[PDB]
Structure formats: C-alpha cells, structure tokens
Design a protein around this nucleic acid. Structure first.
Ligand SMILES: Nc1ccn([C@H]2C[C@H](O)[C@@H](COP(=O)(O)OP(=O)(O)OP(=O)(O)O)O2)c(=O)n1
Ligand SMILES: [Ca+2]
Ligand SMILES: [Ca+2]
Ligand SMILES: [Ca+2]
Ligand SMILES: [Ca+2]
Ligand SMILES: [Ca+2]
Ligand SMILES: [Ca+2]
Ligand SMILES: [Ca+2]
Length: 903
DNA sequence: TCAGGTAAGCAGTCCGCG
DNA sequence: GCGGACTGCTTAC
C-alpha cells in the first residue's frame, strides 16, 4: 500500500513523524530534515525556481531548521523578503508525500475517552488537579473496545466493583441500560488505588497510542486534568509519557476578555468533538453539554441520577461507571451520524497538514496552495504584517414588509468561489486597475466597458485572461468535490420523500427494508417494491435515507465552508495571500451581479406581462432573488388548477423553461461587459412557495431584511410530501428564544401561511390561556454570557449592565457561600427568567447555567416569583405582533357589526 | 469564544425629547 | 414611550 503520515512534529532540528508504512504498519521516525528557503536573484543567474510573479529565485539549503529560521530573522533585519514555506513540517510532508494521499482509516488509531473526578468543593480545576481521577473509559477504534479503568478506593469513598450484568439490564429492572451492542466490547479493570490505575493507563496508552484523540471537552478538561494529576502524583517526566515523543507544552489560548491553558501533546492530533461540532454542525445550541447534544442529535433520553454528581460515586457507583461508559459511546454515536472525524481526515490529508489544522482554513489553504505551486517549481511569498481594515460585503435589498402569496426564489451556485473563477481573482493574476464609475452605472450598463484586454470587477481591478491563477485552480478542485457530495445529499432527500409518500399506505405484512444505495435516485423497480412494504420496513428505510442525507450534508456543506473561507481569508491579515483588492473584487462583483440580475428579471417579467416599471423581484440577499409569482398564477387563473401540486408543476416548468434561460442570457451579457475569463454565474430556481390550493393561507411574508417566512412545496428539485416552512431570521430560528416559544411561534406562522387569519386567532387565544403551565426551562430565554467581571460592582450591576448579566449577578448573590452550587462560567450560555416586583432576589431577573435545572437551593422561589406576563409579552407577543403587522393580519379578532345577533 | 469574511436584525441601557 | 447612540448577542448570507 501507499504510505501515509499519521502525525508530524518539529522538535528542535528534528522532524518526528508517526506514519503507516507500505505494509500497513504504524512506525515512528526522527528525521534531521534540511529545509529550503528562497531569495530573489538576478536574471543573469540560471534557475528553475520562480516566485508567483515570475521573478527568479535562488534556493538556499540549510544545515538544519534552526539555521533556516535564523536566516529569516536576518533577512528581516536586512529588509529583504525571505521566500518559501516557513512551516518546516508542511515542507517535510510535501517532500515526503509528493502524490495524492490515499489513507486507510482502519489503520488510524482513533481514541475516544472521558474521565470522572469526584469533587466536593466545586468544579475540579484542570490546572490544580487536586482530586483523584476515579474513572476513565477509553474507546479504541482499532480494537473496537471500551477500556474501563475504575477506582475502587478513594479518600471520597471505597466502593464495590461495577457489575456488567446490572449495567445491561433495563432501568425498569434496576439497571443502567448500557446498550446491548457494546456490552461485549467492554474490558473492565478495577483498581485498589489511584497510583496503580494511572500507571496502568500510561502503560496502556504506550501500547495503544492515539493518533486522533477525541471526546467531549477533552482539550479543555480531560487532557489537562489527566496530565496535571499524573504530574502532581508522579512528576513531569511521567506525565509527558502521554506524548509519544515525550514532549508537551502548556499552550495559552487567548480570547477577547481572558485566557485559558491547554496541554499540547506532541505527536498526537487532538480533535475535541465539541469543537468539531461547533465548526461543522451548522447549529447554534442553547447548551453544549453532551446530554443536551446527544438528545438533539440522537433523540436519546437524558441520563438521570439522584443527588449531585459529587455524591454519585459514593451513593451509586454502579450508575456512576455505566454513565461514564455511555458518555463515551454517545460521542461515537454522534460521529456515526455526523461523520466529522471522516471529514477532518479527508480535508487534512488533501491539504497535507496536521489533522488538527482543519480548524484553521488559513492553514488549510496555505498548504493547498503551497503544494500546488511547488509542483510547478514556483516559490510562495513571505507572509507580511498588515493592519486590520474594514471592507464592504454583500448587498441586501430592503423588502416592502407585507404578505406575499406566490413566491419563486432563485440563487447563484457557490457565488464567491464562482466569482473567483469567473473573474480569475488570484494574487499573481492582478493585471492592473481601471477608472471606476459608481456601482449603479455598472448595474444599469451605462458605464464605459472597463477593459478590452483584461477580466474585470466593478471595484476597479483587472486580471489576466491567459491562464488560471492558483486560487481559481485550487478552489475549483474543492468546488467539484462539493458538487459531487451535494448530489448524493439531494438524492437521499428525494428518496426520503418517496418513502414518506409510501408511508401513507403501508402494507399489512412482515418484510425487510430494501438493500439500496440512498445516494442515488430510486429506480422504478425500487419504487414498486417500496409501495408493497410494511410501515416498519419503510420507517427503517426512512431512517437510513435520512442518515445518508446527513452524511452528504456534512461532506457538502463543509467543503462549501472551506471554499467560501478562501474568499474570506483574502480579507484576513494572517493569510499569506491577504489582499483587500482581491477581497473587495469578490464582494463588489457580487453586489453588481445581484442588482444586475434583479433588473434583468424585472425587465423580462414586465415584457411577459406587458407592463412597465413594476417590481417582480421583492427581495434579495447576497446572491438570491425572490420573485412574486402572483401575476403568473393569475394569468391562467386559480380555478384552472386541479390541486396544489398542479400549480407547483406549472411554476416549476415556468422557472426552468422561461426564467432560467432569461437569467442565463442576462448573466452572459454581464460576463462580456466585465470581459471575464469564463461565464460561471449559474442562478437556478430554489423555492416554489404558496398557500395550499383553496385555503385562506397567506403563503408567505417579509418583516424586513433577513426576516421572512415561506410555505415551500419544492426546494431545489425536492417535491415534499408535506409542505415545509422555510423561516429565516425570525425568532423561531434564534437559540435565544425560549424552546416552547419557538414552537408556538412556528405554529402561528404555519397557521398564517397555510390556514389564515381565523386559525391564527384560535391558536393565539389558546396559547395565551395555557402558557403558565409550561415547564420553566422551556420558557426561559437563552444568552451567551461575556464580561461578567466588567459589570460586577460588589455583586451588583455596574453602569450599562446587560439584562442577562444582571440575571447572573442576581444568581451569584442567591448562591453566595455555596461551594457545591453550580457556577456560571464566563463565555458560556445561561437560561434567563424575569422576576416579579418585590421578589426575595432583590432584582428583576435571574440567570443560571443553560442545559441545567436551577439548583434546589433556590428553585422553589424562582418558580414562585417567575414573571409570566413579562415573559409572554417579550418573547411571544412582541415577535408575533411584528409578524402579523407585516402580514397585514390581526392575531386578535377585531369587533364587527355582527356581534351580537343572538336571542 | 483559538481557528475565513460582511450585513443586519432585535433586546436592552441610557437619556433626550419642551 | 419612542428613537438615537451605543453594547451585546445572534442571525443570513
Ligand atoms: N458562511 C458563509 C455563507 C455565505 N457567504 C457568502 C459566500 C457565498 O458564496 C455567498 C452566498 O451564500 P450561500 O449561502 O448562497 O452559499 P453559496 O452560494 O456559496 O453556495 P450554494 O448556494 O450553492 O449552496 O455568501 C460567506 O462568505 N460565508
Ligand atoms: Ca461525567
Ligand atoms: Ca461500537
Ligand atoms: Ca442553492
Ligand atoms: Ca448561493
Ligand atoms: Ca403500500
Ligand atoms: Ca443564497
Ligand atoms: Ca468588580
């Protein structure tokens, strides 16, 4: 097999590499790697190396890496550019793996672990590590086993061994419901003392040294705790055995308002799943506890226990251990679904970076581009210092707030990457500038044609047309990959709707789910068999279809993220290729493209309808347009349609056969106007929206920019079995809005769009009546909590104190003195509730850590003093009033002449 | 929240607005 | 009470 790296590190003048050899075995080597860097040289000097601008360079080969880094400093002292890859391990990987890496994940050791620490005096700080580690569960991907290290004897209590038999039994049998599928995979190791537990864990670690290290909060808690605890008990040299190269470093991670410490384990790639989830899931969660996320992702129940976690080991050691094992399993389950480890491996090996560098698109792109240029013996420029400067972004059209009955949307495929490719935007393709007219002049095609030679953006920039820049070349490769995975994603989605349709008529039979590849549209034969299947088999097929869709979504959306981040990186000072001329060339072209096609669509539809100066385009944001289709529907007449799906087919056919050709023509003209390299502005129909045929639903509405709702029947070619609400920006979409309120607002919107004013009034009346019964957590607001210190003045709010921070200060006074009370953590999220006047908390609100029940120290008083009225007005009534005013509807029945006529 | 970008919405504070 | 200047936070793209 072809060899591939596992990890790479620079330690002094040595590269330390863990790798898989040609025989599939894990090996480690120390290499005295001699790096090369580059200086510009005279034309008269014969060379094969040239910088990205075509200037000749001489290669300097150094005796060691220290010499190379020292040369860089001397070149800065002289004031001369020192060219080449200054991250020597990236250069090493480029030299060592000079081909497309094909990796075998089965040879990569992926370790998933979690630890338990009993602590009576509050949260056990990793930096202190003053409490014993009393449980470790460590899953190994190669062995496919959960290794359980269980401390039976502690200063905080001596316990009996964990029982696998009881662990397996149902909660109803007194058991812990450890999943049957993992019971046989548990290797249980009890220990009479902590010293032996940790010594065995390190011996284990040495035998089965993780390559990829993951878990939940491992980088911020588990790793530093284990390292510091071993350090405290045994000394530094023993703790450094967690590194295969015996090297560690305390790394200080700085944010805006403080800093934290992590332990860098050289020769290991830590991918904390919380951090993978935050980057790659495209969610914003009210809480990032494993319990909350596992519930969200897997629909598994909350792991319940009696009393505080600080007494769980002593009171119920059996459950304590079972829950530690289950915690490790839940992270594996989330990954089976989301596949973020797979993604990280794919992207890391593609770029030829340390796997953990996938968190940094700048590092990722720097290596992709470096490897690409190296192939041509081209030499990358030195990174330079830049002051942070603001620059303009996208255009957003101000909508007229209103109801909108029939709507069709259109959207540009991968806009910013498509602009990069069309215009040929790259560091080395800059040809010059032209004299810019106001953007409105380009939009309306009155401005002089910018160039007859070069490819242009309305920001004034001109680019070469003779060859693709390295940025367009490399962005195109990842774009193509993204497009492939999106195809699989959409097929799985369409296949899912086929199954949902069939679930209307399930057959009374005992059968099996079909063995199919959900990434491909179901054949007629598969469709015929599906119509004969039971609900059990169909539901099993639906779950698998939905899993396939998720897998495709991860692969596609994060590749989309990676390519969009290249456009963004051009506007980040730490990028080697930072250039606001290029960054602004992209964004300014985008603004033109949107407003250009707005005009073309308006012109086309005015012609088709035989009118003049009427606005068909009602809204647009960045690269999308929303077109009012009322007149189109009216031109055939609503009474001519057999059902909803009939007018949806008509609009679909109209969008594809009439509008898209007009849009294409409009963009081809714009391409020629800017003299671009290649026409790549592809704007396809996205949504077809409207009320159900024969209903009083309003179809859709806008309240303002980035705030709208649509009742959608078809999205990017997926025809839904049931109409889907597309809601953007409204409170239903905000993590800060209470859970029950999001749900209630969504139902109000559903009623508005699908059923009408009366149905909405019926629901509002009921919600207002019953909402005081809702669980306090489901009606609590959520907020991130930053700068708690800044606004704390003797436990009381300082000037300008934010509402949620006030809540926290209130909480802090109420729990004053309690070491065991849950503390609000700076930078994390809190639930927030308003409090009625004259409450014993001495203020108008209280806030506690999100995803948790408020401590029983104060739970009864909060419940008793919760301000339900304020809560309802602020989170529910005010947003609804916004929705209904925009839609020109009333959420409460107005008085009419008909009342009353009853005798 | 260490880790690509800008536009823009709403909550809330402070305080003016005769 | 509304809105303007501002901070805070959270979305859409
Ligand atoms: N996180 C994001 C999302 C959007 N954008 C910019 C770049 C995109 O090209 C443009 C349009 O965003 P879309 O959400 O429509 O995504 P794309 O057009 O890039 O891809 P596609 O529409 O094919 O899914 O906005 C961005 O810079 N960063
Ligand atoms: Ca735990
Ligand atoms: Ca397993
Ligand atoms: Ca799209
Ligand atoms: Ca798009
Ligand atoms: Ca059937
Ligand atoms: Ca879009
Ligand atoms: Ca203070």
């Amino acid at each position: 097999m072809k060899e591939f790296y596992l990890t790479v590190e620079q330690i002094g003048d040595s590269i330390f590499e863990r790798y898989i050899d040609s025989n599939g075995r894990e090996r480690t080597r120390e290499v005295e790697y001699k790096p090369s860097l580059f200086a510009h040289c005279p034309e008269s000097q014969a060379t094969k190396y040239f910088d990205i601008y075509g200037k000749p360079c001489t290669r300097k080969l150094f005796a060691n890496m220290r010499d190379a880094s020292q040369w860089i400093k001397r070149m800065e002292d002289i004031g001369l550019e020192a060219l080449g890859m200054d991250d020597f391990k990236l250069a090493y990987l480029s030299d060592t793996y000079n081909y497309e890496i094909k990796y075998d994940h089965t040879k990569i050791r992926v370790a998933n672990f979690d630890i338990e620490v009993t602590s009576p005096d509050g949260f056990p700080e990793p930096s202190q590590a003053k409490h014993p580690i009393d449980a470790i569960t460590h899953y190994d991907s190669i062995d496919d086993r959960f290794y359980v290290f269980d401390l039976l004897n502690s200063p905080y209590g001596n316990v009996e061994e964990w029982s696998i038999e009881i662990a397996a039994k149902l909660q109803e049998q007194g058991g812990d419901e450890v999943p049957s599928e993992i019971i046989d995979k548990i290797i249980y190791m009890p220990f009479d003392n902590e010293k032996e537990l940790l010594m065995e864990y390190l011996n284990f670690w040495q035998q089965k040294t993780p390559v990829i290290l993951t878990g939940w909060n491992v980088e911020s808690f588990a790793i530093p705790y284990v390292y510091n605890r071993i350090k405290n008990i045994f000394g530094e040299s023993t703790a450094k055995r967690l590194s295969p190269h015996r090297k560690t470093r305390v790394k200080v991670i700085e944010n805006m308002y403080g800093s934290r410490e992590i332990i860098t384990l050289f020769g290991i790639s830590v991918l904390d799943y919380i951090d993978l989830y935050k980057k790659f899931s495209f969610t914003n969660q009210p809480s990032y506890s494993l319990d909350y996320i596992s519930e969200f992702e897997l629909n598994v129940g909350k792991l319940k226990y009696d009393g505080p976690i600080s007494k769980l080991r002593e009171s119920n050691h059996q459950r304590y251990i079972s829950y530690n094992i289950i915690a490790v399993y839940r992270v594996l389950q989330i990954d089976a679904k989301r596949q973020f480890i797979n993604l990280s491996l794919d992207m890391g090996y593609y770029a030829k970076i340390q796997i953990q560098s996938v968190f940094s698109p700048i590092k990722t792109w720097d290596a992709i581009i470096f490897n690409s240029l190296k192939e041509q013996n081209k030499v990358i420029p030195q990174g330079r210092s830049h002051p942070v400067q603001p620059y303009p972004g996208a255009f957003v059209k101000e909508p007229i707030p209103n109801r909108y009955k029939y709507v069709m949307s259109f959207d540009l495929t991968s806009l910013y990457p498509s602009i990069i490719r069309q215009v040929n935007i790259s560091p080395e393709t800059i040809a010059g500038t032209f004299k810019v007219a106001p953007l409105h002049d380009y939009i309306n095609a009155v401005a002089e044609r910018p160039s007859d030679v070069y490819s242009c953006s309305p920001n004034g920039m001109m680019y070469y047309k003779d060859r693709d820049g390295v940025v367009p070349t490399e962005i195109t490769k990842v774009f193509n990959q993204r497009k492939e995975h999106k195809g699989y994603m959409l097929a799985a989605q369409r296949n899912g709707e086929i199954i949902k349709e069939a679930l209307h008529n399930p057959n009374l039979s005992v059968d099996e789910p079909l063995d199919v590849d959900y990434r491909f549209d179901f054949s007629d034969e598969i469709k015929e068999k599906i119509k004969k299947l039971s609900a059990k088999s169909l539901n099993e097929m639906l779950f698998r279809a939905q899993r396939t869709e998720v897998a495709g979504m991860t692969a596609q959306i994060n590749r989309k993220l990676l390519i969009n981040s290249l456009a963004g990186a051009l506007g980040n000072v730490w990028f080697r290729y930072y250039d606001l001329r290029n960054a602004t060339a992209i964004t300014t072209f985008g603004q033109m493209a949107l407003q250009w096609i707005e005009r073309k669509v308006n012109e086309y539809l005015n012609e088709v309808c035989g009118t003049e100066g009427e606005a068909f385009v009602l809204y647009g944001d960045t690269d999308s347009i929303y077109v009012s289709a009322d007149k189109i529907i009216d031109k055939v007449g609503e009474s001519k349609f057999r059902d909803t799906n009939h007018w949806v087919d008509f609009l679909d056919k109209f969008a594809r056969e009439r509008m898209e050709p007009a849009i294409d023509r409009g963009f081809r003209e714009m391409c020629e106007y800017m003299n671009n390299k290649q026409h790549l502005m592809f704007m396809d129909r996205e949504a077809i929206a409207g009320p159900p045929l024969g209903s009083k639903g309003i179809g859709g509405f806008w309240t303002g920019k980035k705030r709208y709702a649509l009742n959608v029947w078809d999205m990017e070619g997926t025809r839904y079995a049931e109409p889907k609400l597309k809601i953007m920006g409204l409170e239903t979409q905000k993590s800060s809005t209470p859970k029950a309120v999001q749900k209630a607002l969504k139902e109000c919107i559903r009623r508005m769009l699908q059923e009408g004013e009366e149905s909405l009034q019926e629901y509002f009346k009921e919600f207002e009546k019953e909402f005081r019964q809702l669980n306090y957590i489901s009606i609590a607001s959520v907020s991130s909590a930053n700068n708690i210190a800044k606004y704390d003045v003797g436990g009381f709010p300082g000037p300008k104190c934010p509402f949620h921070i006030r809540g926290i200060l209130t909480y802090n006074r109420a729990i004053k003195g309690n070491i065991d009370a849950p503390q609000v953590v700076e930078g994390e999220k809190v639930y927030v509730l308003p409090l009625r006047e004259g409450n014993p908390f001495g203020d108008k609100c209280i806030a506690w850590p999100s995803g948790t029940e408020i401590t029983d120290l104060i739970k009864d008083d909060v419940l008793h003093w919760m301000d339900y009225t304020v809560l309802l007005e602020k989170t529910f009534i005010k947003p609804l009033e916004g929705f209904t005013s925009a839609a020109k509807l009333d959420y409460e029945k107005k008085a009419s002449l008909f009342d009353m006529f009853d005798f």
